[PDB]
Amino acid sequence: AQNPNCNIMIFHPTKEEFNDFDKYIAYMESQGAHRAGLAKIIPPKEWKARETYDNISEILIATPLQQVASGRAGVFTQYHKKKKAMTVGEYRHLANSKKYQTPPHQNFEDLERKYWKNRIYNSPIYGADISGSLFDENTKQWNLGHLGTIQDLLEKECGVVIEGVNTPYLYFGMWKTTFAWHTEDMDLYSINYLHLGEPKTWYVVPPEHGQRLERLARELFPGSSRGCGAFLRHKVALISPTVLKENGIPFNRITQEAGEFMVTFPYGYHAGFNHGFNCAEAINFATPRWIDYGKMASQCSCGEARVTFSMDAFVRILQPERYDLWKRGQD
Ligand SMILES: O=C(O)CNC(=O)C(=O)O
Ligand SMILES: [Mg+2]
Ligand code: NI
Ligand SMILES: [Zn+2]
16 A cells, blocks of 8 residues: 555655546546645746836735634634725735744744644634636646546436536635634635745545544534534644644645645645745646545535535535435525
């Protein structure tokens, strides 16, 4: 079995290898990359996502989210308070202000220490989940707005024809902005490209051990657990590496820098934080190996998780028994 310790693997495709996206995913899995839940892909040196970023300040963040924490430093939840719209130029200036900027630090490890010590005492503002793309239309390789769609994968593998579309999302981060422990909708893959700015640190639990993380989360967040049988779908809970280590939960960590891709694999729980002002682009995708994960994915029916139009069809076709109850949640 390849990669039996479930380490995060890093890949350096050549420009030739960068032509066929699906093929390269299947290659990485041949090497065991999925066992980690997360892989890093460093693009060939000849590749570029776009010529410059010189004109991105005019993008609008219609609903910036202030991430307010509750709990203790290593075990907390965050709620998203909606703020007034602002442009990327306004948000970048805010990120760089004395109130919100990255503190002085020695290296990534020192910064990670300061994040876990101090996160809860601040409320950074995240421009998350903005439909759009920063890939140039002329970028033909690994252009996250030109991927094969999940609907088309389900049609090719299973023959069924469904409504729905699959588009990318932009994320504008600042110091301490946080993504809570989650898997993707329907336990899909994700791919995330860090277009510019400061790094993003990731934590990940191997898919084969995801239920260990779920059981810990039920113990640490016991009222949330009674409220919903899949409350990590709410994307609000944080658990630190120290707490994970104390409770024996297998995990890995890695820092993504500008110009790098990350892939999350089906049922790979992940969480993390941004080091400073940055912009990432991410999208979900599927392969044939996903289908079985899609069929088994948990679902939030309490009503909190409230997701996309396109997830309806996935539930309806892969999980017809759950369909009814999950749609009561969504309506
Ligand atoms: O970048 C972020 O804030 C969160 N991204 C993801 O969870 C992902 O790409 O799957
Ligand atoms: Mg602009
Ligand atoms: Ni994700
Ligand atoms: Zn729920």
